[PDB]
A paper describes a structure:
Epstein-Bar virus (EBV), a member of the subfamily gammaherpesviruses that also includes the Kaposi Sarcoma-associated herpesvirus (KSHV),2,3 is the first identified oncovirus. Similar to other members of the family herpesviridae, EBV has a characteristic three-layer configuration: the outer lipid bilayer envelope containing viral glycoproteins responsible for host recognizing and membrane fusion, the inner pseudo-icosahedral nucleocapsid enclosing a 172-kb double-strand DNA (dsDNA) genome and the middle pleomorphic tegument compartment fulfilled with 20–40 different viral proteins. All herpesvirus capsid shell consists of 4 abundant proteins: the major capsid proteins (MCP) constituting the basic capsid skeleton through forming 150 hexons and 11 pentons, the small capsid proteins (SCP) binding to the tops of hexon MCPs or both hexon and penton MCPs, and the Tri1 and Tri2 forming the heterotrimeric triplexes to plug the large holes on the capsid floor. Once the viral dsDNA genome enters the procapsid shell through the portal that is located at a unique 5-fold vertex of the icosahedral capsid, the viral nucleocapsid is joined by the capsid-associated tegument complexes (CATCs).
By symmetry relaxation and localized classification, we sequentially resolved the structures of the C5 portal vertex, the C12 portal, the C1 portal vertex and the asymmetric capsid at resolutions of 4.2 Å, 4.8 Å, 5.5 Å and 7.5 Å, respectively, which enable us to build atomic models for the portal protein BBRF1 and the CATC proteins of BVRF1, BPLF1 and BGLF. Similar to that in KSHV,22 we also observed a turret-like density located between the C12 clip domain and the portal cap. Based on the agreement between the turret structure that is rich in helix-like densities and the secondary structure prediction of BBRF1, we tentatively assigned the turret to the unmodeled region of BBRF1’s clip domain. By docking the atomic models of the periportal capsid proteins and dodecameric portal into the C1 reconstruction of the portal vertex, we identified two portal regions involved in interactions with capsid proteins. The first one is the clip turret, which interacts with the trunk domains of five sets of Ta tri1 molecules. The second region is the portal wing, which interacts with capsid floor elements, including five sets of the spine helix in the P6 Johnson-fold, the β-barrel in the P1 Johnson-fold and the N-anchor of the periportal Ta. The C1 reconstruction of our portal vertex revealed CATC densities are as strong as those of the surrounding capsid proteins, indicating full occupancy of the five CATC registers surrounding the portal. The helix domains of the BVRF1 molecules and the two BPLF1 C-terminal regions form a helix bundle lying on the BGLF1 molecule. Each CATC binds both triplexes Ta and Tc.
Numbering used by the authors:
A (entry chain x): 199 to 395
B (entry chain W): 1087 to 1149, 1179 to 1332
C (entry chain e): 9 to 71, 82 to 139, 150 to 238, 256 to 364
D (entry chain f): 1 to 160, 172 to 301
E (entry chain W): 5 to 104, 113 to 337, 345 to 395
F (entry chain g): 1 to 9, 13 to 50, 54 to 125, 131 to 301
G (entry chain S): 5 to 50
H (entry chain T): 1087 to 1135
Write the structure that this text describes.
């Protein structure tokens, strides 16, 4: 929330943020149990707090231009993913009414970023390899004056992740306003292995 | 340096824009009790003797929300403090005296031959903060606050000063848009350790209905 | 009389003061002609010299602008009296030798000028690391102790300002220092130069006091006479010289009665408590960024006055 | 180079202040910053010389020397254009100072805190509810005369004659100047540094010259001597008993001439202006900042 | 001791350089050398530091008409604001009489605003900008320097544009009285007497009534159960009716709702979290596009104006309409819109809500302000 | 900018005499294009000799190196504080210059016949600052010591003031002087008034210092130093009068402050010219105005 | 620190990275960072 | 002021360059007798009287 972190972190705002930390610990933590004694308005409370957890994440990935992992039925990008224990997952699915989807598209195999040949030369000689060497050549010794912008270089930030086959992936999807987060509980993975989730 | 000029001009006759407060993000003032010392307000003034003066000055500890003290008798009923009123024991209203004059405004705000504007039956609640030579003006009015440090934000100064009492008693539209467009009611600071008063305009952002209404909660 | 019109056409146009630009991404030729300041160093071709325009009288123009060309005083010093690992941006001090026909001068950087003070009684660790023997510096001044003893050391040293280029010769080193003007290097990639003064020798005078901010806050040097050996401190301030003498008297107020208590002034010349001199001005906003200075072993803290404008004055006595 | 600073007024301006300020065009004004646009606060000496009864002239000198200088030429409503003064540039400075000081040919100007009353060089800007004072500019000999008259009033406060000290005299006109009673510890600090210099002078003052001046007043009489009223001072009697020796006289002068440069440079407070080619028909001069 | 060993492609030169080596390298004939025997006599393993790409933010220009704040302010590109010391507007308002005449001639004045930041450039990237490169390393230096100077120039005009939005927000906040005064003063049941003493006392009573009952409505929007949506609509609608729309520029079509011919008639400026809350209490919005002007209007000084401007000032807005001078509303309508008409109507992405018959647009600026590290 | 000044007027020996000094400087009258003979250096002031008026005239007008001498013109460039120049040490009192030494211009105290050209043109002397202040002291003490032995033969001796005044010393350079051994009393010599100022200020320094300390010590403590340096003067100058007519005392104080400031501005040598790199093989030096 | 200041073909993405940035760097969320104000904001020399 | 840079690097590991003295031409100091004096080398030291 930028409205407290706007001033510049003097003494008299951190001594306020510590009291705000304590007030959010005393009241708003452990929010699944405040919904069971809520009575009737539990779905609104849980759907508020999940969206509040989402929007308070500065999710500015530099790879946010990569159109990976969209939802299957609609076509919206899946921005963000939840991880829960399996005991709370059914209560989350019943409290949030029903899923809007049962599968999401995504990359089928890992993108291959390999050492190319000019990369191999600078690998042997100095030992320092960049990501996209031919792209650096195109931006330096071919057209350096070309002012590259967001529509111009969006293939270069997506190292092959964008053209690879999109298979479905079975995962529960919920909808929080315009953002569509997909929930998953991998507790089945651990309980057959006797390690603590 | 990149220069740019622009000249706006108001087209609607009446007000064309409203500001409404909506939410309270953080009560930033750390609202407790910490009264400031008068010995930083008046570091020069002292008693006759030196050693008893230093004894008292060491006893009270004279060396982040600032309170001040208005002295009142014990015979004030709690009903005056129940309703949100003016803290000087007198209903300091701005409009039941006439606008653009000084006789009847000083008569309603300081003379006690006319009774209080709120109650039908009493002149004031305390006579130590409503007279023309009371304790409240001798503490906080600017006419007797000379050789005092500017930059302290004594909060009770806004409930007493004569310049605000003349500034509010202009035309009401003139009063409200000069309240909005100029934020200078000699207010507090924004984020410092102790509350200073601000000097440069359009840097920090603060308004007060306290100097608009002369009441308190 | 029509040729006078062509002469006034060749004489009229000032540097462009205003320019009604429209957008930023277009990069018009007119805004380029505003922002293009001519260079000083170019490759050696007559067409390349003509585009660089170095043949123009006084200031550079392709066949006045509030900018001053720097002068470059040249010095000669013995190779042991200087360390070639000195920084580029460091101020220097000439000591006038006593021979009538000299040729070879005697220049002291403050690191070297420190060991003219310590021997005879961190920072001193580095000053003994770089200039290892004081005996190679104790002789460039012939009579140091007598000259401190009558307190006429300050009028023998005139500051020459910061260093630029050190051609590392074998025996008789030739250095170039800017006595006046915009301090800028003579390199083929013309890199910026920042004047450095060691941190322990340099106390701020602004934050020593702990609304009017000008652009040019000056830098002052000060030689002071202590009974524990004289000291060279440096001073940054945004005040006038009238203010600098009073606030320096208040700053040196312990040291004057320190010297008064330890050494009574028996003669009439000990009463001079050192002097000051304006070394020049710089930018008051971006001033005195800290940095580090490594020799092969150690690291002293050091300030970096960046983009300095050198201007020496004489000595005004502190008292 | 482009040196234009426009100062935006936070409110409008009434017509009387417009008429008053357009008379005050070409005078030297101080500024808070050196940036592009500024507001009305920080302009003028009125922030440090407030609407009060006790002045402080040396802190005004400090505020003048610390900040930059400018000249006001174009003034209108809501806006008034200033032109900065930076070392390296030349300017034209007009003579719009109402104590009408006739300027010498090619002398040197000096800025000055307003000694001729606050109300003399002041525009009341009640629209922005603030005050702008205009710092006086007058030539350097009159500057030093005003300054030494100020300090002599500050030191003869504790003694008593008043009209013969707190009123300057010029070829054009004699003027009166406003006198406080205490300039605070900064004026006392100026007197501190002055007495420091002075007591070390009278430690190190030479004794050949006193032995000259005793026989010179007893031999000759001049305008440079008639202030003694043909009477030898007592320290001339109790000082010239000693013999006259060359070496300690040279050693005294070799520090006396060093100290007097510092004593001159301590009176360099306030920015100085070495101008050139003043014309008595245009009332302006080509000036630059020294 | 000053030498690596990576498996370089070693050129096999057939000099007799092998001879007389170890007695020489025992004495340190060379200054930097590292003897490798045994298991160190190997072409070493390839080790490298991977540079995973460099990244930056393309600073988008936030055009002044690309934000919906310019529905609050129509604008005309005036190419010569340097020579306009003053601008006034005369209002003749005629008050009719009612059986059981008056004219309000009010004067309004303009006030100018100056804004200026300071970009900065080193003397290196001007002298290398004027010079010409010939080797491609100098060409690579030159293109970097012109990129820096172009970045500084585009930064300068972008900072100037953000300053324009800042000045617009400041001048709108300066003529903005609070909610608890214009909630009552817009209600004409208290201007019906004529503002005598006791009705003024009841007005300052009603201010205190509205302060502890109606201020901070959004905090009372959480404790009202499911009655939050109607409460928010009922507060913002009477805020909409609290402001005088009696403006002489209301007759022209500045901004439309991009889906009908509905005028938008207002703008809300909120913060981030207030926007995220309001678009959830007001449900689905109406639209996500607003037709508005693509460019500023233009007002130049032609010669019939210019003769007066050089003679003694007093330059009129519309000398042609003055020189043609009955009058009606629709005849005087195009002289009011002095260039705001026939703009090519480029849409603007901004959220719009609906309060009865007003389709008010609501937008947040934090995406602009909090990219400058300045408090909103 | 344009820097040349063409002045209009010689014969062959005049051509050779002016050609001898084609690297020296002299002041002008104005910064215009064409001028006359009378507007050239030191002509209208030096022909009774008096130092303080000539130093005031040298700080008054600007300065100029000359470049070429024709039969009827003298091509010369005035110096501006912008850019740098190249001048020469072509003066008959030869003071050897050094690297990064500040050069001064004093009016000619070394006799008319050395630094002149008989047509008139009088060139000022150029010489470095420690030599300048030392020759100022050693001409001033020579003046007062000559006046004393003209008054009283038993106070000093003539050879007593030639073992220590006929020679200046700077970095081993032990020059001699042309001291005027017959000045003549009652003024009428060069530097006759500067000694007459120095004696009056050294006479009024006790009345100044004691009055200042007694007036500053009542303001109790701004600083301890005004009483801390009460021990360093002798007690003879301490107990002098403590009482005089404050009209007379104030007049004496005002005259001593004015003469002190004028003398301290003169002991600062005037137009200080700064060198960068002197070359004795070429007798030239880079120089610019400061 | 470990920051390299050599020039680069800085790929431009459209994510607004700078949400509460200068307060974060003055608090030091990043491991190692360089604040370049004014004249040093250019591409350094090769 | 012109400028020119050259960058030498030795591509032979051993000595690749030698120098003899070939012939004498003149012995420009005479192999004579003029001894130095310590009164000029150490002028500071002196005797009792």
């Amino acid at each position: 929330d930028p409205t407290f972190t706007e001033r510049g972190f003097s003494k008299t705002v951190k001594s306020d943020l510590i009291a705000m930390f304590k007030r959010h610990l005393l009241e708003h933590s452990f929010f699944l149990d405040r919904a069971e004694n809520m009575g009737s308005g539990f779905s609104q409370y849980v759907r508020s707090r999940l969206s509040e957890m989402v929007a308070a994440v500065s999710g500015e990935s530099v790879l946010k231009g990569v159109s990976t992992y969209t939802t299957a039925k609609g076509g919206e990008p899946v921005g963000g993913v939840f991880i829960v224990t399996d005991n709370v997952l059914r209560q989350l699915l019943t409290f949030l009414g029903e899923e809007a989807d049962n599968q999401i598209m995504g990359p089928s195999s890992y993108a291959s970023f390999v050492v190319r040949g000019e990369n191999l030369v600078t690998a042997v000689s100095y030992g320092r390899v960049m990501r996209t060497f031919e792209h650096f050549m195109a931006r330096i010794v071919d057209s350096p004056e070309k002012a590259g912008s967001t529509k111009s270089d969006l293939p270069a930030v997506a190292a092959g992740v964008e053209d690879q086959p999109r298979v479905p992936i079975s995962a529960a999807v919920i909808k929080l306003g315009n953002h569509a987060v997909a929930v998953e509980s991998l507790q089945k993975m651990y309980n057959d292995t006797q390690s603590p989730y | 340096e990149v220069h740019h000029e622009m000249a706006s001009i108001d087209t609607g006759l009446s007000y064309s824009s409203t500001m409404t407060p909506a939410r309270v993000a953080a009560i930033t003032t750390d609202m407790g009790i910490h009264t400031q010392d008068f010995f930083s307000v008046f570091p020069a003034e002292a008693f006759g003797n030196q050693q008893v003066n230093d004894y008292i000055k060491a006893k009270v500890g004279a060396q982040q929300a600032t309170c001040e003290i208005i002295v009142t008798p014990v015979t004030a009923d709690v009903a005056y403090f129940q309703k949100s009123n003016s803290p000087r024991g007198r209903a300091a209203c701005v409009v039941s005296c006439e606008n653009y004059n000084q006789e009847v405004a000083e008569g309603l705000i300081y003379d006690h031959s006319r009774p209080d504007a709120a109650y039908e039956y009493r002149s004031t609640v305390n006579p130590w903060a409503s007279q023309l030579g009371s304790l409240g003006d001798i503490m906080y009015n600017s006419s007797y606050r000379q050789t005092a440090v500017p930059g302290l934000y004594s909060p009770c100064r806004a409930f007493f000063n004569k310049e605000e009492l003349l500034r509010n008693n202009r035309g009401l539209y003139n009063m409200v848009n000069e309240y909005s467009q100029r934020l200078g009611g000699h207010p507090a600071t924004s984020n410092t350790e102790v509350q200073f008063v601000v000097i440069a305009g359009t840097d920090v952002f603060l308004e007060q209905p306290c100097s608009f209404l002369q009441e308190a909660f | 009389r029509r040729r006078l019109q062509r002469r006034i056409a060749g004489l009229l146009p000032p540097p462009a003061r205003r320019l009604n630009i429209s957008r930023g991404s277009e990069f018009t030729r007119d805004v380029r002609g505003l922002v293009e300041e001519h260079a000083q160093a170019s490759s050696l071709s007559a067409a390349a010299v003509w585009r660089a325009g170095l043949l123009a009288p006084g200031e550079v123009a392709v066949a006045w602008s509030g900018w001053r060309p720097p002068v470059f005083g040249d010095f000669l010093i013995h190779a042991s009296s200087f360390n070639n690992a000195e920084a580029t941006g460091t101020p220097l001090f000439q000591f006038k030798q006593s021979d009538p026909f000299s040729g070879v001068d005697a220049v002291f950087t403050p690191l070297s000028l420190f060991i003219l003070m310590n021997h005879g009684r961190g920072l001193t660790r580095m000053a003994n690391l770089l200039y290892d023997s004081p005996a190679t510096l104790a002789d460039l001044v012939p009579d140091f102790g007598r000259l401190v003893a009558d307190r006429r050391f300050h009028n023998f040293i005139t500051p020459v300002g910061p260093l630029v280029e050190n051609i590392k010769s074998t025996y008789l080193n030739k250095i170039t220092t800017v006595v006046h003007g915009p301090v800028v290097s003579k390199a083929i990639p013309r890199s910026t130069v920042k004047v450095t003064v060691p941190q322990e020798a340099f106390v701020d005078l602004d934050a020593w006091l702990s609304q009017p901010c000008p652009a040019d806050a000056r830098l002052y040097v000060a030689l002071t006479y202590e009974e524990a050996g004289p000291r060279f401190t440096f001073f940054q301030s945004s005040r006038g010289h009238c203010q600098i003498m009073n606030i320096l008297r208040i700053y040196y107020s312990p040291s004057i009665m320190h010297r008064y208590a330890v050494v009574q002034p028996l003669h009439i010349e000990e009463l001079t408590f050192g002097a000051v001199a304006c070394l020049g001005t710089f930018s008051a906003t971006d001033g005195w960024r800290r940095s580090a200075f490594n020799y092969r072993g150690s690291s002293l803290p050091v300030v970096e006055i960046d983009s300095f404008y050198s201007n020496v004055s004489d000595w005004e006595v502190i008292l | 180079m482009d040196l234009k600073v426009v100062v935006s007024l936070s409110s409008r301006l009434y017509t009387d202040e417009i008429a008053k300020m357009q008379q005050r065009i070409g005078c030297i004004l101080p500024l808070a910053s050196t940036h592009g646009t500024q507001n009305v606060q920080g302009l003028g000496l009125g922030q440090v010389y407030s609407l009060e009864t006790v002045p402080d002239y040396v802190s005004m000198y400090n505020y003048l020397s610390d900040c930059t200088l400018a000249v006001l030429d174009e003034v209108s409503v809501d806006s008034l254009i200033l032109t900065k003064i930076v070392p390296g540039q030349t300017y034209a400075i007009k003579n719009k100072y109402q104590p009408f000081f006739q300027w010498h040919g090619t002398g040197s100007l000096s800025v000055m805190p307003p000694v001729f009353g606050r109300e003399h060089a002041t525009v009341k800007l009640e629209s922005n509810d603030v005050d702008i004072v205009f710092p006086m500019v007058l030539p350097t000999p009159i500057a030093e005369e005003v300054l030494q008259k100020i300090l002599l009033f500050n030191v003869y406060s504790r003694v008593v004659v008043h009209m013969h000290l707190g009123s300057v005299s010029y070829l054009g006109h004699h003027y009166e100047l406003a006198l406080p009673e205490v300039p605070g510890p900064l004026g006392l600090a100026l007197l501190d540094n002055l007495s420091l210099y002075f007591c070390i002078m009278v430690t190190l003052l030479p004794r050949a010259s006193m032995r000259l001046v005793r026989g010179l007043i007893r031999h000759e009489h001049h305008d440079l001597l008639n202030l003694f009223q043909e009477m030898v001072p007592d320290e001339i009697a109790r000082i010239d008993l000693d013999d006259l020796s060359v070496a300690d006289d040279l050693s005294r002068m070799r520090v006396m001439m060093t100290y007097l440069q510092s004593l001159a440079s301590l009176f360099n407070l306030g920015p100085r202006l070495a101008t050139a080619a003043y014309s008595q028909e245009t009332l302006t001069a080509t000036c630059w900042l020294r | 001791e000053g030498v690596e060993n990576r498996p370089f492609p070693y050129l096999t030169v057939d000099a007799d350089l092998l001879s007389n080596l170890r007695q020489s390298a025992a004495e340190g004939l060379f200054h930097s050398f590292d003897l490798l025997v045994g298991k160190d006599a190997r072409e070493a393993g390839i080790k490298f530091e991977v540079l995973l790409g460099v990244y930056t933010n393309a600073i988008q220009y936030v055009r002044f008409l690309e934000t919906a704040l310019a529905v609050s302010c129509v604008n005309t590109e005036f190419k010569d604001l340097s020579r306009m010391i003053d601008g006034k507007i005369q209002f003749r308002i005629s008050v009719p009489t009612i059986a059981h005449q008056r004219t309000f001639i009010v004067v309004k004045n303009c006030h100018k605003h100056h804004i200026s930041t300071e970009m900065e450039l080193s003397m290196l990237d001007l002298e290398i900008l004027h010079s010409i490169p010939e080797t491609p390393v100098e060409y690579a230096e030159y293109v970097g320097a012109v990129k820096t100077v172009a970045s500084a120039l585009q930064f300068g005009v972008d900072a100037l544009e953000r300053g324009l939005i800042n000045t617009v927000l400041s001048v709108k906040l300066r003529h903005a009285p609070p909610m608890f005064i214009l909630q009552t003063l817009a209600d004409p049941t208290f201007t019906e007497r004529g503002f005598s003493k006791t009705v003024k006392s009841d007005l300052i009573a009603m201010f205190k009534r509205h302060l502890l009952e109606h201020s901070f409505f959004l905090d009372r929007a959480e404790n009202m159960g499911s009655g939050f949506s109607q409460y928010v609509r009922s507060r913002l609608s009477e805020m909409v009716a609290a402001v005088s729309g009696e403006s002489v520029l209301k007759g022209v079509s500045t901004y439309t709702t991009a889906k009908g011919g509905e005028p938008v008639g207002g703008v809300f400026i909120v913060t981030d979290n207030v926007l995220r809350q309001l678009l959830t209490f007001l449900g689905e919005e109406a639209d996500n596009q607003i037709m508005g002007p693509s460019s500023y209007a233009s007002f130049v000084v032609r010669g019939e104006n210019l003769v007066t401007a050089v003679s003694y000032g007093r330059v009129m807005r519309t000398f042609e309409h003055f020189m043609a001078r009955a009058g009606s509303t629709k005849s005087d309508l195009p002289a009011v819109a002095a260039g705001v008409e026939d703009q090519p109507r480029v849409p603007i992405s901004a959220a719009v809500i609906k309060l009865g018959n007003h389709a008010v647009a609501v937008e947040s600026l934090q995406k602009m302000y909090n990219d400058t590290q300045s408090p909103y």
